[PDB]
Amino acid sequence: MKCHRCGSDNVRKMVDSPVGDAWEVYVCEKCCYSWRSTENPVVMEKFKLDDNKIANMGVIPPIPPLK
C-alpha cells in the first residue's frame, strides 16, 4: 500500500478510529503524507514528490550549527 504522494512503501498506520472500527489513518515515513482509509486520494502531479524534490526542498528556517 504505497503513499499516494511519493509512492513509497515506507508507510505505517498512525491511529485507529477512537470509536468503533470505522477507519484507520496511515502516514508516509518518507514524505509525511497521511490519509484515512475512507478517502481515495488522487494527488495532483504538481503536488507529488520524489527523492529529488524532497532532497531539494526548501528547509524553513535553516538549522543553525551546533554549539
Binding site: 477512537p18 502516514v27 509525511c32 503524507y33 497521511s34 543553525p64 554549539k67
Partner: protein
C-alpha cells in the same frame, strides 16, 4: 455582551439563528469541509455549522464560527445586522483602550484544566481531525491560537505573544508548524536549536471569538495580547490560567483544548501543502515539528476548526477589520479628513478609503499616504478613494462612485516598480508591484468640474426611520 468561552458564543449564535446543527452522523471527508465551503457560499447571514456526530470520533466539530458579518457583529456584542462600517467604527473605538490587564485564575477554576492527558497522547481521541482541502498534505488544525513567550523573563506578558498558525497533524502526538512565520521566536529558536534545546509553546483550540481575533492580529495594537482582548471587550478583562508544564506560558481559562508541547530542535520535515488566504495551495516545505507533551481539555470538548478556500471564506473575516483599523489610524494621524478605510481584500491588497477632499487632488495624496505605511507600501496594490458620504464597505456604493466620478483619463494612476508582496501571484517581477490608484472622488477647487451636479441628499428623518423600520422588522 462578553463571552467567557466559545460555548457562550455558540449558544448566542444559535439563539440569533446563526448556527446549524447537523443532527446526523457525517463522514470526516469530504463532509465537514464541504459544509464549511457550503456555509461560506450562502453569501449573507452565513451561519456556523455544528456537527454532533462524526464517524469514528467521540466529540464535536464546529466551523464557520466567524464566517459572516452577522457572526462578526455578535462577536463584538452588537446587534447581528450591524453594518460593516458601523462594526468598523466600534472596533476603532475599542482599539486603544488601556489598561485592561487579564485576570489570572486558579488552576482548578479554569475549565480548560478539567481533563488531563499526560501519557499515550492521542490527538484523535480529542479532536475529530479531517482533511480541509483535497490536496492538503494531512489533517490540519486551522484555527488554533498559539502562545509563545520568553522563558527567562516572563516579562509580565510583555514578551508573551499569541498568533494563528496552521497546524499539520504529523502523528498522534506530533504536529508541524511554520517557525519563521512565528515572529518573536526567530532568535529564541536559533539559540534553542544551536544548543539542542526544546522551545515550549501552547496550542489552544476552541476559544472566545475575541481571542481568535487578536491571535489573527499580528500588528497594529500596542497592548499585551490578552490585554488587547480585554480592550476589544470594551474594558472587561479576560480570564487566563498558567499552563501546566510551563510557567511563562498562559492560556485562556475557557479553551476547549490546550496542547502543551515544544518545538523539537534541529528537526525539519515535509509540511504542506495547505491553503492560504489568496485562495491557493502553499508549497510543500521542510518545516518544524512540535512534540505535544500534555493535553488539557474541557469535558466533551468542541473542535473549533476553520475552512478556507476561494474567498470569501471564514478566514477573510478573521483578517478584515483588524487590518483596516490600524491603517485608518495611521492615515488619520496626519489626515483627519479620512472617514474610513476598507482594507478587507486579500490582506489589504485591495483598499478603499473614504475621505473628505481638502483641496483639489487631495484624494491621491491620501492614497500616497496609504502607499507609504508599513503595511500599505508592500501590500496595497489597488487603492480606491471615495468621498466622505460614500460607505467604502458598501461595494454597491463604491461601484456607483466608480461609474460617476472616475474619468479613467485622469482619475487612474499606474505606477511601476513599487514594493510588492510575493503572495500576489500576478506580480511580475515577483515581489514587485505596479500600483493602481483610482480617484473616485468629486472634484473640488481648484480642479475643474466638467458638470457640477447636486446629489440626492437623503430626506430628513432617514436615520430615525432606519431605527423605526428595524424595530418593526424584528417584530414579525
Amino acid at each position: 455582551k462578553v463571552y467567557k468561552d466559545l460555548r457562550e458564543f455558540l449558544e448566542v449564535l444559535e439563539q440569533e439563528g446563526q448556527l446549524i446543527r447537523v443532527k446526523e452522523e457525517v463522514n470526516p471527508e469530504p463532509d465537514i469541509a464541504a459544509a464549511g465551503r457550503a456555509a461560506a457560499n450562502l453569501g449573507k447571514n452565513q451561519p456556523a455549522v455544528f456537527f454532533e456526530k462524526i464517524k469514528g470520533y467521540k466529540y464535536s466539530v464546529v466551523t464557520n464560527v466567524h464566517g459572516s458579518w452577522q457572526n462578526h457583529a455578535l462577536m463584538l456584542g452588537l446587534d447581528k445586522n450591524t453594518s460593516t462600517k458601523d462594526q468598523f467604527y466600534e472596533l476603532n473605538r475599542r482599539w486603544d483602550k488601556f489598561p485592561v490587564p487579564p485576570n489570572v485564575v486558579k488552576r482548578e477554576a479554569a475549565p480548560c484544566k478539567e481533563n488531563v492527558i499526560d501519557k499515550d497522547i492521542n490527538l484523535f481521541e480529542i479532536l475529530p481531525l479531517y482533511r480541509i482541502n483535497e490536496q492538503d498534505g494531512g489533517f490540519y488544525i486551522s484555527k488554533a491560537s498559539v502562545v509563545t513567550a520568553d522563558p527567562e523573563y516572563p516579562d509580565d506578558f510583555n514578551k508573551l505573544n499569541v498568533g494563528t498558525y496552521r497546524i499539520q497533524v504529523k502523528d498522534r502526538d506530533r504536529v508541524g508548524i511554520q517557525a519563521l512565520a512565528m515572529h518573536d521566536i526567530a532568535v529564541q529558536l536559533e539559540k534553542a536549536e544551536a544548543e539542542n534545546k526544546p522551545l515550549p509553546i501552547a496550542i489552544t483550540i476552541g476559544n472566545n471569538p475575541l481571542v481568535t481575533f487578536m491571535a489573527s492580529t499580528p500588528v497594529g495594537y500596542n497592548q499585551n495580547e490578552y490585554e488587547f482582548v480585554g480592550a476589544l471587550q470594551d474594558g472587561v478583562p479576560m480570564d487566563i490560567v498558567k499552563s501546566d508544564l510551563y510557567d511563562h506560558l498562559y492560556v485562556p481559562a475557557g479553551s476547549e483544548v490546550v496542547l502543551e508541547g515544544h518545538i523539537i530542535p534541529r528537526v525539519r520535515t515535509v509540511e504542506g501543502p495547505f491553503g492560504e488566504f489568496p485562495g491557493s495551495y502553499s508549497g510543500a516545505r521542510l518545516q518544524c515539528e512540535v512534540k505535544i507533551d500534555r493535553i488539557t481539555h474541557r469535558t466533551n470538548p468542541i473542535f473549533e476548526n476553520l475552512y478556507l478556500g476561494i474567498p470569501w471564506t471564514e478566514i477573510d473575516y478573521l483578517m478584515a477589520l483588524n487590518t483596516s483599523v490600524p491603517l485608518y489610524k495611521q492615515l488619520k494621524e496626519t489626515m483627519p479628513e479620512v472617514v474610513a478605510v476598507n482594507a478587507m481584500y486579500t490582506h489589504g491588497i485591495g483598499v478603499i478609503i473614504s475621505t473628505k477632499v481638502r483641496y483639489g487632488g487631495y484624494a491621491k495624496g491620501v492614497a500616497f499616504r496609504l502607499l507609504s505605511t508599513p503595511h500599505g507600501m508592500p501590500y496595497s496594490k489597488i487603492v480606491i478613494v471615495v468621498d466622505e458620504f460614500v460607505d467604502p464597505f458598501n461595494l454597491e456604493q463604491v461601484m456607483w462612485a466608480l461609474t460617476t466620478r472616475v474619468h479613467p483619463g485622469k482619475d487612474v494612476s499606474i505606477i511601476e516598480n513599487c514594493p510588492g508582496m510575493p503572495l500576489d501571484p500576478s506580480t511580475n517581477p515577483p515581489g514587485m508591484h505596479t500600483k493602481m490608484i483610482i480617484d473616485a472622488t468629486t472634484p473640488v477647487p481648484p480642479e475643474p468640474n466638467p458638470r457640477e451636479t447636486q446629489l440626492l441628499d437623503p430626506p430628513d428623518g432617514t436615520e430615525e426611520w432606519e431605527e423605526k423600520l428595524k424595530e418593526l422588522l424584528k417584530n414579525q
